[PDB]
Antibody, heavy 115, light 107 residues
Framework: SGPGLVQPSQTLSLTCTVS????????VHWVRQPPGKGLEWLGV???????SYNLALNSRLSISRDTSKSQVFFKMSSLQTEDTATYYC????????????????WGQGTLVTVS | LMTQIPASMSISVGDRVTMNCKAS??????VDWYQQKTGQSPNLLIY???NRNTGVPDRFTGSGSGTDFTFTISNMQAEDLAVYYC?????????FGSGTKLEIKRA
């Protein structure tokens, strides 16, 4: 949740409520799907706390979480027209200890529209 | 990053199909495959290049070496239509393939 219509430059915070498990035990990934069906990685957060992003949103989006309340957050700032898309969150079932990072989803979406 | 070919894949029920992806560099075996049935979120099929996720029927199998990985469906059934996506998770940033839409050829 947290989605909706957008004017370009605006800000927005999406949430993601998890259940069935503890947030310290796995990771969570913000991935979007644009209207032309393309899928993009928005942000990740290693199990230690570090977080990467692609250049696409570097400096504008800020992923965060609350291991206590079981919440994942995405704080978009300076929204652009190209951020329009469905936003999902997922846990990864792949410790990057052994060089994978598989991504189990569990989100049903939440459409953000920047116009 | 990733390249997925083909874009569209018309297949008849019972047929076999293959979708492949290529990586810009070596990512070993960390490539998974997702099915996004129409009107739903994507779902996992194979992870680790070749391992089937729980619940996935064995008509799906994965393989690949160096930079090319392939998903194979031996006997295409009706439920298998939708868009498939490969993704690697070798190292960051994680990246998805552009997608291959499988459509069922019918009378």
């Amino acid at each position: 949740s947290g989605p909706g219509l957008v004017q370009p430059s605006q800000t927005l915070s999406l949430t993601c409520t998890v259940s069935g498990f503890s947030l310290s035990s796995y990771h969570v990934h913000w991935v979007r799907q644009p209207p032309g069906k393309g899928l993009e990685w928005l942000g990740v957060m290693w199990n230690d706390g570090d977080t990467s992003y692609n250049l696409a949103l570097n400096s504008r989006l800020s992923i965060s979480r609350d291991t206590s309340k079981s919440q994942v957050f995405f704080k978009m700032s300076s929204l652009q027209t190209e951020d329009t898309a469905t936003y999902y969150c997922a846990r990864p079932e792949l410790p990057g200890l052994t060089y994978g990072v598989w991504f189990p989803y569990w989100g049903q979406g939440t459409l953000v529209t920047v116009s | 990053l990733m390249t997925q070919i083909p874009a569209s894949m018309s297949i008849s029920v019972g047929d076999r199909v293959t979708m492949n992806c290529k990586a810009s560099q070596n990512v070993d075996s960390n490539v998974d495959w997702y099915q996004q049935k129409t009107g739903q979120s994507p779902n996992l099929l194979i992870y680790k290049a070749s391992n089937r996720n729980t619940g996935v029927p064995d008509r799906f199998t994965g393989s690949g070496s160096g930079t090319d990985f392939t998903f194979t469906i031996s006997n295409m059934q009706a439920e298998d239509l939708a868009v498939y996506y490969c993704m690697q998770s070798t190292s960051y940033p994680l990246t998805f393939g552009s997608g291959t839409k499988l459509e069922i050829k019918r009378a």
